[PDB]
Symmetry: C2
Subunit: 201 residues, 2 copies
């Protein structure tokens, strides 16, 4: 079900993937101005009732094409708009109302960053009010307690990946790193990103 | 599903708690000499098969009577023994093959601690190879990233609870704090326990 995180207006719900054996995580930011979902996996019946009670959904943000997940189903059931990465605008699996690029702010406090060198071009990462970073696939966590990157054979350009991760590690106020795949970090996120950079340096 | 944690031989599987938007968590320590479950929640057929492939179950440790959870059902389908807190031996909800006291070591490396003042007497906490603390109910986590205790209204004696937590905080090598209710801590566990103590001082 939808669990509250390190702040009372952020939730995550997940689908276990039997093939790392790893949890695929969706995220919700609940706001009076309109709730926002990120890389949403399927919502259970309970989860829908909870989400409707919290005010529904006005935006779904997708970090990359492999994270389309249940976005189409959720859009068909609501009046939400969908935002995706501008680098994948010409061949995206679903219709998006808006294409996001590095430096955009979808709503006040939700900043967009494009990462290079990943398995898809211009994979998005989101900075929510400076202290919460949300990643799609490039930064993930199979071993609980740390942060990892996608393996080398899935990368378009490892040099660009290291540069991307350094940019994330340079975000001065990051406390939490919420990950689309695996174990999210809720405290000392900047320190976990720093350790990750050291493994790639 | 059952997922590996901060070390590859520890797993957790969980059931959602709609009252507080957090999970109820079971834990498994996979060992050549016999697997150990702690406060086990229900196992799906898939999780069963996964556990079976890892060697099954030899012991279930229950930290307190309120975490009996799915222990009966698992006991009925396996030859597991069950261990519980000696302080509740006279009225426990299921038959136990062994009663644990403070200082006991169930198997080498799995040290037992009795906590005082909680909602049940002599609630157990477990210290696995000095660096992983596993708690039942007294220490839990609703806000992801920290550690909390049960509210005052559930405690038998707050003064004893504070002394019990101070003791947990005195375990010098703790990095992970696995909790029966809510968000487990995988890194810097001692520091989270120290912060919790500070809120009770
Ligand atoms: Cl089942
Ligand atoms: Mg993924
Ligand atoms: Mg409990």
């Amino acid at each position: 079900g939808m669990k509250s995180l390190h702040r009372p207006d952020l939730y995550s719900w997940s689908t276990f993937n039997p093939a790392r054996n790893i949890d695929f995580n969706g995220f919700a930011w609940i706001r009076p101005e309109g709730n926002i979902l990120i890389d949403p996996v399927a919502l259970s019946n309970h989860d829908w009732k909870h989400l409707e009670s919290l005010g529904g959904v006005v935006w779904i943000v997708l970090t990359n094409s492999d994270h389309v997940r249940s976005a189409k189903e959720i859009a068909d059931q609501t009046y939400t708009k969908i935002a995706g990465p501008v680098a994948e605008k010409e061949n995206f699996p679903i219709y998006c109302d808006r294409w996001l690029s590095d430096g955009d702010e979808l709503v006040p406090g939700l900043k967009v960053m494009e990462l290079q060198g990943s398995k898809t071009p211009g994979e998005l990462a989101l900075l929510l009010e400076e202290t919460t970073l949300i990643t799609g696939d490039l930064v993930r966590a199979y071993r609980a307690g740390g942060l990892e990157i996608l393996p080398d054979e899935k990368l378009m350009n490892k040099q660009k990946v290291v540069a991307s991760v350094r940019r994330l590690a340079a975000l001065e106020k990051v406390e939490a790193v919420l990950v689309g795949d695996g174990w999210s970090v809720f405290r000392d996120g900047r320190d976990r990103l720093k350790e990750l950079v050291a493994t790639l340096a």
